[PDB]
Amino acid sequence: MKILKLQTLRGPNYWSIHRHKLVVMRLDLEDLYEKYTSDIPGFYKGLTEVLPSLVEHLCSPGVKGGFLTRVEKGTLIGHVIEHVAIELQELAGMPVGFGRTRETSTTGVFQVVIEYENEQAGRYAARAAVRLCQSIVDTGTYPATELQQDLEDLKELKNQASLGPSTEAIVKEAEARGIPWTQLGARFMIQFGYGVNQKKIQATLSNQTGILGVELACDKEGTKRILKDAGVPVPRGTVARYFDELQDAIEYVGGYPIVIKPLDGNHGRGITIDVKNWQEAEEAYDLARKASKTKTVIVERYYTGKDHRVLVVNGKVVAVAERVPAHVVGNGKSTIAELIEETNRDPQRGDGHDNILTRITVDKSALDILGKQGYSIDSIPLKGKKCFLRATANLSTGGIAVDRTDEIHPENVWLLSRVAKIIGLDIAGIDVVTEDISQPLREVEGVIVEVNAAPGFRMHVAPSRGLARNVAGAVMDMLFPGSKNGRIPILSVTGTNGKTTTTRLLAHIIKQTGKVVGYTTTDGTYIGEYLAETGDNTGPQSAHLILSDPTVEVAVLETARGGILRSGLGFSSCEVGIVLNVTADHLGIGDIDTIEQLAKLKSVVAESVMPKGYAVLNAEDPLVAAMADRVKGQVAYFSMDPNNELLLRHTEAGGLAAIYENGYISILKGDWTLRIEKAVNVPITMAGKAPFMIANALAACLAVFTQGVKIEHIRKGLSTFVA
Numbered sequence: 196m197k198i199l200k201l202q203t204l205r206g207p208n209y210w211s212i213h214r215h216k217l218v219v220m221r222l223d224l225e226d227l228y229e230k231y232t233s234d235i236p237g238f239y240k241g242l243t244e245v246l247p248s249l250v251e252h253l254c255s256p257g258v259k260g261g262f263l264t265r266v267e268k269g270t271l272i273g274h275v276i277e278h279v280a281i282e283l284q285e286l287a288g289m290p291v292g293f294g295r296t297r298e299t300s301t302t303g304v305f306q307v308v309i310e311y312e313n314e315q316a317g318r319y320a321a322r323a324a325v326r327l328c329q330s331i332v333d334t335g336t337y338p339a340t341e342l343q344q345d346l347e348d349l350k351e352l353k354n355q356a357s358l359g360p361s362t363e364a365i366v367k368e369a370e371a372r373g374i375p376w377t378q379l380g381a382r383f384m385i386q387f388g389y390g391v392n393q394k395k396i397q398a399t400l401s402n403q404t405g406i407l408g409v410e411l412a413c414d415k416e417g418t419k420r421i422l423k424d425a426g427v428p429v430p431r432g433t434v435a436r437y438f439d440e441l442q443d444a445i446e447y448v449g450g451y452p453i454v455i456k457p458l459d460g461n462h463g464r465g466i467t468i469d470v471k472n473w474q475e476a477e478e479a480y481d482l483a484r485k486a487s488k489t490k491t492v493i494v495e496r497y498y499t500g501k502d503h504r505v506l507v508v509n510g511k512v513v514a515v516a517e518r519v520p521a522h523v524v525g526n527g528k529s530t531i532a533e534l535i536e537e538t539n540r541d542p543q544r545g546d547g548h549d550n551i552l553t554r555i556t557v558d559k560s561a562l563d564i565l566g567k568q569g570y571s572i573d574s575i576p577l578k579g580k581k582c583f584l585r586a587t588a589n590l591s592t593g594g595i596a597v598d599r600t601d602e603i604h605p606e607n608v609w610l611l612s613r614v615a616k617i618i619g620l621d622i623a624g625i626d627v628v629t630e631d632i633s634q635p636l637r638e639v640e641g642v643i644v645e646v647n648a649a650p651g652f653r654m655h656v657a658p659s660r661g662l663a664r665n666v667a668g669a670v671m672d673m674l675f676p677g678s679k680n681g682r683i684p685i686l687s688v689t690g691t692n693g694k695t696t697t698t699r700l701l702a703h704i705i706k707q708t709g710k711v712v713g714y715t716t717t718d719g720t721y722i723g724e725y726l727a728e729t730g731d732n733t734g735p736q737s738a739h740l741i742l743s744d745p746t747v748e749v750a751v752l753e754t755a756r757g758g759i760l761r762s763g764l765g766f767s768s769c770e771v772g773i774v775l776n777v778t779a780d781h782l783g784i785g786d787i788d789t790i791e792q793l794a795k796l797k798s799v800v801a802e803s804v805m806p807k808g809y810a811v812l813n814a815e816d817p818l819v820a821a822m823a824d825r826v827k828g829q830v831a832y833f834s835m836d837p838n839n840e841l842l843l844r845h846t847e848a849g850g851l852a853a854i855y856e857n858g859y860i861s862i863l864k865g866d867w868t869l870r871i872e873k874a875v876n877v878p879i880t881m882a883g884k885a886p887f888m889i890a891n892a893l894a895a896c897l898a899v900f901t902q903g904v905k906i907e908h909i910r911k912g913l914s915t916f917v918a
Contacts, residue, residue, distance in 0.1 A: 196222070196223065196224075196225070196325050196328075196329045197223040197225070198220065198221075198222070198223075198322065198325065199221040199222070199223050199304065200219075200220070200221040201218065201219075201220050201221075201318060201321065201322075202218070202219045202220075202761060202762075203217070203218050203219075203311075203314055203317075203318070203762070204216070204217040204218070204219065204762060204763045205735070205762060205763060205765075206735070206762070206763035206764040206765060206766065206767065207763055207764045207767075207799050207802070207803045208759060208760075208763035208764070208799065209759065209760065209795065209796045209799065210295060210308050211293065212799065212802055212803060214293050214310060215763070215767070216310065216311050216312065216314075216317075217293070217308050217309065217310055217311065218308065218309050218311050218314075218317045218318060218321055219306065219307070219308045220306070220307045220308075220309070220321055221299070221304055221305075221306060222273065222276070222304065222305045222306075222307055222325065223303060223304055224272070224273075224303055224304070224305060225303060227272055227332070228302060228303050230272070231269035231270065231271070232266050232269060232270055232271075232272060232275060233266065233267060233268065233269035233270075234269060235332065237335060238331055238332060238335065239263075239266055239267065241331050241335050241336045241337075242266065242275070242279075242331060243263065244336070245327075245331065245336060245337045245342065246279060246282055246283075248282055248285075248286070249262060249263065249278065249279070249282055250263060252278060252281075252282070262278055271296070271305075272328065273296040273305045273307055274296055275328070276296075276307060276324055276325060276328055277294040277295070277296055277307050277308075277309055277324075278294070279324045279327060279328065280294070280307075280309050280320050280321055280323075280324035281294055281309065281310075283320050283323060283324055283327070283345070283346075283349075284311070284312075284316060284317065284320035284349060286346050286349075287316065287346060287349035287350050287353055288350070288353070289311075289312045289313065289316060289349075289353060290312070291309070291310040291311060291312060292310060293308075293309075293310035294307075294308065294309050294310060295307070295308045296308075297786070299786055300786070300788055306786060307321075309321055313352065313353055313356050314356075315352050315355075315356060316349055316352045316353050316356075319345075319348065319349060319352060320349060323345050327342075327345075358383070358385075359398050360549050360651075360653055361398050361399055361651060361652060361653070362383075362385060362396075362398060364652075364656070364666070364667040365385075365396060365667050365670055365671065366385065367667070368665075368667035368668055368670070368671045369387055369671055372671065372675075372680065373680060374387055374388065374671075374675065374680045374681055374682075375387070375388065375389060375680075375681065375682070375766075375767060377739070377743075379395070382397065383397060384396070384397050385397075386743070387674065387675075387681050388675075388680065388681015388682065389681055389682060389683045389685075389742045389747075389750070390681075390683040390713075390742060390744065390745070390746075390747040390748055390750070391683070391745060391746060391747070391748055392679075392680075392681035392682070392683060393681055393743075393745065394674050394675075394681065396674075398649060399622050399649050399650065399651070399652075399670070400622075400648070400649050401621060401622070401673075401674065403621050404620065404621055404622070404648070405619050405620075407619060408618055408619030408620045408648065409620070409648040409649075411618060411619070412618060412620065412623070412646045412647065412648040413648070415645060416458075418618065418645070418646055419432075421617065421618070422614065422617070422643060425613075425614075425617055427610065427613075427614055427617075427643055428636055428637070428641060428642050428643065429642055429643055430495050430496060430498055430642045430644070431447070431448055431449070431495060431496045432448065432493050432494065432495030432496065433447050433448065433493065433494060433495070434458065434491060434492070434493045435491070435492060435493070435494060436490060436491045436492075438480075441476070441480065441494065444494045445494070448494060448495065448496040449496055451470075451471050451472070452469050452470060452471045452497040453470060453476065453494050453495065453496060453497055454466070454467060454468065454469070454470075454494070454495050454496075454497045455467045455470065455476065455479045455480050455483050455492060455493075455494055456483065456492065456493050456495070457483045457484075457486060457487035457488070457489075457491075457492055457493075458487065458489055458491050458492065458493060459487065459488050459489055460486070460487065460488075464486050465482055465483045465485070465486025465487065466483065467479040467482075467483070468586065469497060480492060480494075498628050498640065498642050499628075500628050500629050500630045500639075500640070500641070501517055501518075501628070501629065501630070501631075501632075502517075502518050502588055502626060502627065502628050502644070503515055503516065503517050503518070503599065503626075503627045503628075503629065503632055504516045504518060504624060504625070504626060504627075504650075504654065505611050505624070505625045505626075505627060506622075506623075506624055506650065506652060506655060506666065507611055507612060507614075507615040507620075507622070507623045507624075507625065508621070508622050508666070508669045508670060508673055509621060509622075509669070509672075509673040510612050510615060510616055511612065511669075512600075512603070512608045512611055512612065513655075513664060513666055513669045514598075514600050514652070514655040514664035514666060515598075515599045515600045515603055515632065516596045516597065516598060516599065516654055516655055516658065517596070517597040517598075517599050517632070518588045518589070518590070518594050518595070518596065518597075519581075519588065519594055519595040519596075519597065520583045520584075520585055520586055520587065520588040520589075520592075520594055521555065521583065521584045521585050521589075521592050521593035521594050521595075522581040522582060522583040522584060522595075523538075523581070523582055523584065524576065524579070524580075524581050524582075525575055525576040525579065525582070526579055528575070530572060530573050530574075530575070531572055532572070532573075535555070538555065539554075543659075548591065549653075551590050551596065551653055551654055551657050551659065552593065552659070553590075553591055553592065553593050554593070555584065555593050556592075556593075557584075561584055561585050564584070564585060564586060565582075565583075565584050568582065568583065570582050590653075590654050595659060595660070596654050596655075596657075596658045596659055596660065597658065597660045597661060598658040598660060598661020598662055598663075598664075599632055599661075600661075600662070600664060601662075602632065602633045603632050603633065604632070604633055604634055604635050606635045606636075607632065607635060607636060610636065611625055611627075614643060614646070615646075618646055620646070620648055621673065622648075622649075622650070622670065622673075623646055623647065623648065623650070624646070624647040624650030625643060625645075625646050625647075626643070626644040626645045626646075626647075627641060627642070627643055627644065628641065628642055628644055629641030629642075652666040652667075683742075683747065683748055683749060683750060684748070684749040684750070684770050684771075684902065685749075685750045685752070685766060685768075685769040685770050685771070686701055686749070686750070686751045686752070686769070686770065686771040686772075686773065686898060687752050687754050687764075687766075687769040687771070687772050687773070687800050688701070688751070688752070688753050688754065688773045688775070689753075689754045689755075689756075689772075689773065689774055689775070689797055689800045690773075690774060690775025690776055690777075690797075691775070691776055691777055691778045691780060692775065692776060692778070692887070693775055693887065693888075693890070693891045694716070694717075694753045694754075694755070694775065695716050695717050695718065695753060696879070696888065696891050696918065697773065697775065697891045697894055697895050698714055698715075698716045698751055698752075698753045699714075699716065699916075699918075700879075700891060700892065700895040700912075700913075700916055701714070701751050701895045701898060701899065702714040702721070702751050703912050703915070703916045704895060704896075704899050704904070704908070704909055704912035704913065704916070705749055705751070705899065705904070705912075706723075706724075706912070707908045707911050707912045708904060708908055710748045710749055711723045711746050711747055711748050711749075712747070712748070712749045712750075712751060713727075713741040713742075713744060713747035713749070713750050713751070714741070714750070714751035714752070714753075715731065715733060715737040715738065715740075715741055715751075715752050715753060716733065716753040717733060717753065717755075719731055720737050720740060720741065722741075722744055722746070722747060723746075723747075727740070728740065732758070733752075733753050733754065733755045733757070733758055734755075734757070734758035734761065734762055734765070735758060735762050735763070735764070735765030736765075737752070738750075738752055738764075738765030738766060739765060742765075742766070752765075752766075754800055756787075756793070756796055756797065759796060759799055760784075760785050760787075760796070763799075764799065764800070764803060766803075767803070768803055768804065768805040768808070769800070769803060769804060769805070769808065770804075770805065770807075770808045770809070770902075771804075771808060771809050771811065771898050771901060771902065772800045772801050772803070772804045772808065772809070772810050772811065773800075773811040773894055773898055774797060774798075774800060774801055774810070774811070774812050774813065774819050774822065775813060775819075775890070775891070775894060776813055776816050776819060776890075777790070777793055777794050777797050777816060777818050777819055779793060790818065791818075794818045794819075794821070794822075797819075798822050798825075801822045801826050802822075802825060802826060802827075804826060804827055804828045805827065805828060806827045806828050807828060808827075808828040808829075809828060809829050809830075809831055809851075809898070809901040810822070810826050810828060810829070810830050810831070811831050811833060811894055811897050811898050811901070812830060812831070812832055812833075813832070813833060813834065813890070813894075814832040814833065814834040814839050814841050814842045814845075814852075815834050815835065815836060815839065820832075820841060829851065829901075830845075831851040831852060831853070831897055831901060832845055832852045832853075833852065833853040833854070833890070833893045833894050833897050834852070834853075834854055834893075835854075835855050835886070835889060835890055835893070836854075837854045837855065837856040842854065846863045846865060849865065850863055850864045850865030850866075851863075851864060851897075851900075851901065852897075853893045853894075853896060853897040853900075854893070855874065855889055855893060856868075858873060858874050858875065858883070859871070859872070859873065859874060860872050860874055860877075860889075860892060860893060860896060860913075862896065862897065862900055869906060871896060871906065871909055871910055871913065872910060872913055872914070874889065876914060877892060877913055877914070878914075878916070878917050878918070879891075879892070879916065879917070879918050880892065892913065896909055896913070899912075
């Protein structure tokens, strides 16, 4: 066994369409080229004992265990290799359901294509499958330790190339609406859309979020002072530097209880929670002063009440959640000694920061807090009341969320929207403390605690009590207001002979309209008028360069067969797909040895056309004209012979064709003929002496006309263009 070549495909390709992520492997069968699995004794048992899960494989027979029967009857090792690769990357929790195997031109090389979900994980699984099969055929079995090592390595690879849960939520919401998304390589940023309609998000911060708002939100004193000047109720407090002044400060705040905090401190350095007398206040002040970097301390009035987390998107309240501190209830007439195991049976509990329900950590601080809480380990709750384990009221600690979105006063909604607009944050998370959220914050003693610029919404998606809110939908609506996507006009030109001239002519014609056109061809990648890249390829790299520019409005791409074979198309769909001709002038490259294979390879551009798009095909070539079916969207024929039966039949029922009838480049829109040029005033045609350029001119004119460009613009562009 030897791995000859391992390539990855990310878009539509020769092998399949709508299965964008694939891996192709050229496998060398030096000795087992014609060696059936049933021909070698006692490896069926080894395969079925090393991987029993293959019993789940429903093969071509369509019956449970059909692949095992296929192995029993004797089958080429490529099929079992792809199956064990599928199962081996399935054991890591990665669902894949596509795989193919074919024979190459030479007798000793097979081509195996495997569906993958992660690029590195897929490549690792493909590399490991052949090693496992070779070890099995060499020794009769595979060690379990190596299998476990490979599985844990796959799990690590899957975990490594994973995004934060907010990012998958937003990406899934975007994919549900058919909006393209790509991953930038700078700072885990995700870009939605193409050209001038693109947006960028990191986790929840958009390109519209301001520096000033984010910086102000991080400054607690600054935001408190700003909110106080706008009439927003904020917790009362006062700064002090001398001991004797503390008493006076107690007069201003209103008495007890109070909260002690230092002026300059991050992540709550040296801050107390609740003090209700003189000695504890004195010791807390001393501790804060010893922790404070400037000897000065703010004392503020302690506000009691239920705390809520409100999410504001685009100035509108999306979800309201009430936090309850981590607690236990003795409603089952049981103490903590049994509830510890009772809670562990809930599947929601887990480690990490992805699940809202975390394991109850019985730490020394928590144990001390519950000891001073006023209850014991075996003390039954009185009247059936919740007994808390901590006072931080955090979901990561193990708190409980309650949905309160519906029962909120309209005045509170208005106030929170005003606060979010005042701070200057498109997406914000506000912490409120109030006795009741169904009443205005004036009657009750409610205050605004703090504002967060980049909040997580995992708490609102899974409230655990109440209705879930579609935060990702609201964010996606904010990014793209209407029923619009970040798509720009795309024209993909493919063919054997005249791709470059057609692409340049299309770019020149569209340039007549006041639009910035980005086009890639063999010569180089151009953005409008100025050259962007000299030594470029016609593969997905140039397409990504074109589509990521914030000034490109229309993209014109020359798509060669090398890019499709190596990495596939760089886009999911195109508005216009032009196929010029297919001639077997050069063959033998890759697995393309027959003109039917070349036609199938070139058919990817035509097949990857959205239902509202157009496929511009040559009616003269039978192979190109055979692509009329299996194509979504309208089909437009261009032909140098005005007497083509297929073109006339298509025009009689429908239209949108282009012909060269009497020294004229004419467009048939059904029963009407529109003449463009005299075919001798076009410089590239050389007074009609070159018949090959007329086909390219016809294709370009038809493609431009399908997009709604006026006739005079086409005439002006065709008359001026030079080679």
